[PDB]
Amino acid sequence: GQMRLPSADVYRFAEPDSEENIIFEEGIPIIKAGTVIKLIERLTYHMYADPNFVRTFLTTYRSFCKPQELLSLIIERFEIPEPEPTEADRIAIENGDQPLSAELKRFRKEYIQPVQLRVLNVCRHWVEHHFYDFERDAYLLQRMEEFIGTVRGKAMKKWVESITKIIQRKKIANITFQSSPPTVEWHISRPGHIETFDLLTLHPIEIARQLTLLESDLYRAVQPSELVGSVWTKEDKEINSPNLLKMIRHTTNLTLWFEKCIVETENLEERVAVVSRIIEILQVFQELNNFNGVLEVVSAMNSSPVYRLDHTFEQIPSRQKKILEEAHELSEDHYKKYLAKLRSINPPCVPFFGIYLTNILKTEEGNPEVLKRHGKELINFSKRRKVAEITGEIQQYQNQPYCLRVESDIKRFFENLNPMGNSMEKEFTDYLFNKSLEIEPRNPKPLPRFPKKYSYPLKSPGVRPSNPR
Amino acid sequence: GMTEYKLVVVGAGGVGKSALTIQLIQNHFVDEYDPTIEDSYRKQVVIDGETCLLDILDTAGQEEYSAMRDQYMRTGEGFLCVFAINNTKSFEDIHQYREQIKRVKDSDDVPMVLVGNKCDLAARTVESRQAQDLARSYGIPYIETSAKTRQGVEDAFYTLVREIRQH
Amino acid sequence: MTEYKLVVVGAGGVGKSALTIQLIQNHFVDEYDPTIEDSYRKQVVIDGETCLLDILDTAGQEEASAMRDQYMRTGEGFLCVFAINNTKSFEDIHQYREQIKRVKDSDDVPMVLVGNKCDLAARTVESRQAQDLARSYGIPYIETSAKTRQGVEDAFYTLVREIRQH
Numbered sequence A: 001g002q003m004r005l006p007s008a009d010v011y012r013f014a015e016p017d018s019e020e021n022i023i024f025e026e027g028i029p030i031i032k033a034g035t036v037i038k039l040i041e042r043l044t045y046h047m048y049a050d051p052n053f054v055r056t057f058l059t060t061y062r063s064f065c066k067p068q069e070l071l072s073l074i075i076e077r078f079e080i081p082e083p084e085p086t087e088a089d090r091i092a093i094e095n096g097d098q099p100l101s102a103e104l105k106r107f108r109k110e111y112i113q114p115v116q117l118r119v120l121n122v123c124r125h126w127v128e129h130h131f132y133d134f135e136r137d138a139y140l141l142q143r144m145e146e147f148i149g150t151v152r153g154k155a156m157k158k159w160v161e162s163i164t165k166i167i168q169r170k171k172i173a174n175i176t177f178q179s180s181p182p183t184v185e186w187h188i189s190r191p192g193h194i195e196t197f198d199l200l201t202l203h204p205i206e207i208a209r210q211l212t213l214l215e216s217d218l219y220r221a222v223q224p225s226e227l228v229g230s231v232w233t234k235e236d237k238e239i240n241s242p243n244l245l246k247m248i249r250h251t252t253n254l255t256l257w258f259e260k261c262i263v264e265t266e267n268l269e270e271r272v273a274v275v276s277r278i279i280e281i282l283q284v285f286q287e288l289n290n291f292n293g294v295l296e297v298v299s300a301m302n303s304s305p306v307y308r309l310d311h312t313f314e315q316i317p318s319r320q321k322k323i324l325e326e327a328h329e330l331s332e333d334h335y336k337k338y339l340a341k342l343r344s345i346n347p348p349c350v351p352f353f354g355i356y357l358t359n360i361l362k363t364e365e366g367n368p369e370v371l372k373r374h375g376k377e378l379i380n381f382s383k384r385r386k387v388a389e390i391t392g393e394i395q396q397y398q399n400q401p402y403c404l405r406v407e408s409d410i411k412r413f414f415e416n417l418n419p420m421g422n423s424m425e426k427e428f429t430d431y432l433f434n435k436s437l438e439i440e441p442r443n444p445k446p447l448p449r450f451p452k453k454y455s456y457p458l459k460s461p462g463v464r465p466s467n468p469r
Numbered sequence B: 001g002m003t004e005y006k007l008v009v010v011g012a013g014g015v016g017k018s019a020l021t022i023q024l025i026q027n028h029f030v031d032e033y034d035p036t037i038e039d040s041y042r043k044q045v046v047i048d049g050e051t052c053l054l055d056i057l058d059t060a061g062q063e064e065y066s067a068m069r070d071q072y073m074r075t076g077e078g079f080l081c082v083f084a085i086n087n088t089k090s091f092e093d094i095h096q097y098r099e100q101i102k103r104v105k106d107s108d109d110v111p112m113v114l115v116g117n118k119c120d121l122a123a124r125t126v127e128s129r130q131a132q133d134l135a136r137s138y139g140i141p142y143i144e145t146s147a148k149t150r151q152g153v154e155d156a157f158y159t160l161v162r163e164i165r166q167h
Numbered sequence C: 001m002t003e004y005k006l007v008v009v010g011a012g013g014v015g016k017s018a019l020t021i022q023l024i025q026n027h028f029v030d031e032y033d034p035t036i037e038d039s040y041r042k043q044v045v046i047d048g049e050t051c052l053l054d055i056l057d058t059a060g061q062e063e064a065s066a067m068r069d070q071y072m073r074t075g076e077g078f079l080c081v082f083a084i085n086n087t088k089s090f091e092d093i094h095q096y097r098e099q100i101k102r103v104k105d106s107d108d109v110p111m112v113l114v115g116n117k118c119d120l121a122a123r124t125v126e127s128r129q130a131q132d133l134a135r136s137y138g139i140p141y142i143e144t145s146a147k148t149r150q151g152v153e154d155a156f157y158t159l160v161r162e163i164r165q166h
């Protein structure tokens, strides 16, 4: 038979499952809804481990349970009472013999030790991957340190001593490759001559590589804490989502910089060379699976100031029109081809974050926090699982690093790029559109001519890499 | 066969804009949603006895990607310009949204509706008369909607489709 | 995209976690933090086919030895890891092999034998001894270093091929 359990009066996690406290989806069960007690029971279940559930729970629990209360509940879960001697044990003791204690030994081996270890696994994941709870609440950290540091008994000792050290490390807190990265490529601007760096003077290969390293780093820095609760849309977004916002603002600045480079090049022939260079950078972005970069370019070419430059469009080579068209087709039909491409490529890649943001926000807005069943309010856990599926996908693409060498000066150039200067957004984008109207006026106004502004060769070095010995 | 209308929702973030399309497209009668599901934004409807397909683009959550607005807006034939009735800033944003739509579409007469959205029980700060006056100054309809009861939701989208049909 | 459930098993301290984190993050973990149970995901193209690896990183410490059936039921293929400078970890391999076969009620479970820490000069398990055992199991033997990356992709992706061919 199954093991007997402590009385539900002395140990709350032994209450029987019922539809008043847990609901499963239609080979381990998947939870649709439950009380917090039942969620924590299944989070630390004696029959099986569920590391995905641990991640999902630790990512999303703050929408239904405070950190201080979670810690109290898992400490309660940990403190399991042992059963009393059975009749056979009693009779052995009465005869001066050692009892077999079979039921006690089984309960220790098959209930207490697995549940306790899985509680410790929750603690370990909490500290390793969700340490912000403890950064933001020093007293919570004190409680965790004290709980872990006072667990007695040899079965848990290795993990208790380990978790103590992990915590201490996290308080005061390297890549290997299968290959050498390719050689940094240079064009008109030479190493160390940052004053000459510009769209046409840096090598287009190296523009795309250095922007990809930058955008990859920005992508990799975004934590789930910046996403759950839709906090990047709320009034405190600068406090709660700074890495996400830095990432988006980089993308916005690069798109605006592309538009600015285009419309401030008043000479038609020179502007054609600018656009062609931008589409070459897009080509390298595609080769690098930098989908953020792809869309930065697409967004610039589809913007109101650029889209209307029909005279510039007429001179772009067919092969480059096709490249831009294929890139734009990734976004069509609600990103249908993008989603399929992302799921087919070999990472490293830089996903476009915007889709994740919309899906997280709509999942949180479109599903209720609780389900009402039999007069009880149950936590709607399926909603949290859906959010954690998205944050899990994000994290999966954050693991793989690019095998590309940083060029510190080119990196700094793109880090400090500021196309809008001191202008506000509306004034700056009106300026771009008025510049578009100036360089290619609306029909029937005649097309003016403009003098060249670049004194250096406009010919691209192309986007196929070179390799000296 | 049937006509498909490409509708785009625009408006300030952080104030419940997404409830409009969610409530429309939803299993109207079960409060649940998976936005990742292919065609969670497509809906076949009958408007004035004529069956059509609505394809709704709502990029709620991406508002900080401000240089992508043109890219997104260019896909649309008609626009819902949404503000929250308890957020005056979102109401004041409407003028620039409209100007940006006119620019992307290169037209002074783009089918659009103004939508005032009640996203919570916090105090209203934009009175219906203010929003009616704004809509009238633009020559477009005004619809108020509830983010909780689905009231006004069908009216907002159907009114927009009528604006497209009568353009 | 096919999904593959891989499980990494073996004695405590042989490098199951370091191998996994090297595969996932291209980073070598110097610390010895005993695992309870960790899981990772990795999208990767293998033999031209994109798949999604779910990797379960298990506990080697003997205090967890009663909790294995649950993960062996879910796993599709198993990396059986020992350390080439630890003879006892090699002797522990057959206990994992037999338990997996029992739980899955199968003589034909996808597996790879992995001899880890091959960056260390002071070997105590000879390649021939491990290779003999692998042949007796019908499975490949791959020596690895989570420190240098030697053999790491080969070990995991060979296991994927075994599952694919099963």
Ligand SMILES: Cc1cc(Cn2c(N3CCNCC3)nc3c(C4=CCNCC4)cc(Cl)cc32)cc(C)c1F
Pocket (backbone or CB within 6 Å): A275, A298, A299, A301, A302, A306, A307, A308, A309, A310, A312, A313, A316, A320, A321, A324, A325, A328
């Ligand atoms: C200076 C300039 C401007 C563009 C702008 N551009 C254009 N038009 C149409 C109007 N005539 C002007 C070029 N159409 C598109 C398209 C699509 C066309 C068809 N399939 C859907 C997407 C996509 C993008 Cl990202 C940019 C586009 C394009 C290039 C190459 C260019 F140099």
Ligand SMILES: Nc1nc2c(ncn2[C@@H]2O[C@H](COP(=O)(O)OP(=O)(O)NP(=O)(O)O)[C@@H](O)[C@H]2O)c(=O)[nH]1
Pocket (backbone or CB within 6 Å): C010, C011, C012, C013, C014, C015, C016, C017, C018, C019, C029, C030, C031, C032, C033, C034, C035, C036, C058, C059, C060, C061, C116, C117, C118, C119, C120, C144, C145, C146, C147, C148
């Ligand atoms: N030199 C060298 N050291 C290694 C290698 N793999 C792991 N180590 C070291 O061996 C120790 C144990 O590694 P670890 O990955 O934690 O082993 P484990 O098998 O996961 N342990 P557990 O079963 O307790 O979870 C660590 O100090 C780690 O740095 C390797 O290939 N070479």
Ligand SMILES: [Cl-]
Pocket (backbone or CB within 6 Å): B046, B047, B048, B049
């Ligand atoms: Cl109707």
Ligand SMILES: [Cl-]
Pocket (backbone or CB within 6 Å): B086, B087, B088, B089, B125
């Ligand atoms: Cl207000």
Ligand SMILES: [Cl-]
Pocket (backbone or CB within 6 Å): A395, A396, A399, C024, C039, C040, C041, C042
């Ligand atoms: Cl992962």
Ligand SMILES: [Mg+2]
Pocket (backbone or CB within 6 Å): C016, C017, C018, C033, C034, C035, C057, C058, C059, C060
């Ligand atoms: Mg380990």
